[PDB]
Amino acid sequence: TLIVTTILEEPYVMYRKSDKPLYGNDRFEGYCLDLLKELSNILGFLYDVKLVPDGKYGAQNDKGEWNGMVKELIDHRADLAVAPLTITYVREKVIDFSKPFMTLGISILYRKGTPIDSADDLAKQTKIEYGAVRDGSTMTFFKKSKISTYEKMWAFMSSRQQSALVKNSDEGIQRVLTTDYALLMESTSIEYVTQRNCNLTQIGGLIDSKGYGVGTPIGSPYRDKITIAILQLQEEGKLHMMKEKWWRGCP
Amino acid sequence: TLIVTTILEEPYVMYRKSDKPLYGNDRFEGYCLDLLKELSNILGFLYDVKLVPDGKYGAQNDKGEWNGMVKELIDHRADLAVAPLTITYVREKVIDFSKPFMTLGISILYRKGTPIDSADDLAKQTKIEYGAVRDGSTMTFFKKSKISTYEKMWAFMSSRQQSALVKNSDEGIQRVLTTDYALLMESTSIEYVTQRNCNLTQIGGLIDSKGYGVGTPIGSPYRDKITIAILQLQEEGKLHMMKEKWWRGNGCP
Ligand SMILES: O=C(O)c1ccccc1O[C@H]1CN[C@H](C(=O)O)C1
Ligand SMILES: O=C(O)c1ccccc1O[C@H]1CN[C@H](C(=O)O)C1
Ligand SMILES: [Cl-]
Ligand SMILES: [Cl-]
DSSP, rough: OOEEEOBTTTTEEEOOOOOOOOOGGGHHHSHHHHHHHHHHHTTTTTTTEOTTTTOOOHHHHHHHHOOHHHHHTTTOOEEESSSSSOOOHHHTTSSSSSSEEEEEOEEEESSSSSSSOSSSHHHHOHHHHHHHHTTSHHHHHHHOOOSSSHHHHHHHHHHHHHOOOOSHHHHHHHHHHHHSSSEEEEHHHHHHHHHHTEEEEESSSSSOOOOOOOOOOOTTTTTTHHHHHHHHHHHHHHHHHHHHHHHHHOO | OOEEEEOTTTTEEOOOOOOOOOGGGGEESSHHHHHHHHHHHHHHOOOEEEEEETTTOOBBTTTTTTTTTHHHTTTTSSEOOOOOOOOHHHTTTTTTEOOOSEEOEEEEEEEEOOSSSHHHHHHSSSSEEEBBBSSHHHHHHHHOOHHHHHHHHHHHHHHHHHOBEEESSSHHHHHHHHSSEEEEEEEEHHHHHHHTTTTEEEESSOOOOOEEEEEEEEEETTTTHHHHHHHHHHHHHHHHHHHHHHOOSSSSO
């Protein structure tokens, strides 16, 4: 029996709506749940789902200590990590990512019927406020980026004691829905919001490219099996059936 | 010093146009050449480029024997494989792919100003001929697919002794440019053709999703370092600079 760490995030992992209390893996539903069931079908294993204790994805502090699911894997406290976990330079040095089961990039969430079309328009303007979720991967991108426009936008974001940032995605969506605010976030979620908020839309394309990968500890025997299984589901179109299932309109 | 097997394909690996003979790595230019230089910058190694002898990518025959670059890596005849090599189920069981340095999918190459808009439009019709390169990965997808539309299209393609298929991509491009033909192929090439053939365009989106990865033999010490370096170039935007360099054309009206 394997242990699978994960985090709550629509529509990947959500508390299932039921009248009676639920127990174990039956407590959760979502894209990553279906993906985990298919993984258990291919590789043939039993799995127990455990939300990450501190509710964090995975970053390292100044002394080099990791948190969240990444740390769960490093300490051999979880066997798998099935969640929208971004494949980054620093994360892959400490854990093993499978081949990406979803490809995406940073984009812009804003209102419809406006003249804004790119991040350069946001950079050339200070009336509309723009920012991202604190400590998320997008913030890390703008922090580390050396592209001119993105260093300017990071200056605006960090400015005023980082007042332009939000603690979580839903607070950012609300800030867009109530003020003159643009929220830079991962595009797979922008699809969800836009498909469920017909007055919001994505502005521009993808600023970069990245992917969600299943995480395993370094030296795990299930590494190759997980990668091969992910590719097997990719070529069968199953992953796209799942995404289309959990994501589907707007005029 | 490492040995890197590869294959010729615009704009990944092309013979540079010169008046005088060229020698060694100076013979070649392209996207994968720039990527290989940056990789050598990160990991710090010397490399020698070797075109794959049989000029094949990598497939297995009826008895289970591999050819092309894949076989080059399996037999420890190459250290790296830097080429538009698709990360497939059957290939990863025998070699190690890095994280993809380019993501793409199967799409349709056709003419502009026509009513065709999706693979469903092609599937409902037998007047317009459509197909793909024989034994390639694009053909393999339609071979294995269990979706209704793609099983229908596979019937049309295989029909008439596979008369709808072509031997290579360039013959397919010519077939589109001269007859009423649609060529299903990897989208990264459709972008190149469309940028250099302003009367051709891509029809629809991506039928599937896949990626090009640097190939190494199983158990190579350069594996993790190559993957990490590829991700480092992804986060620096270098891969997009290279693609935009080798893909932008002179524009279309
Ligand atoms: O970071 C965001 O902007 C974001 C906005 C909405 C929803 C999810 C977001 O990212 C999460 C999931 N991937 C990031 C990681 O792998 O660390 C963190
Ligand atoms: O097959 C195609 O659609 C194609 C069209 C133009 C150029 C190259 C093409 O395929 C090569 C590259 N990817 C395939 C592989 O890595 O297995 C073989
Ligand atoms: Cl994908
Ligand atoms: Cl990429």
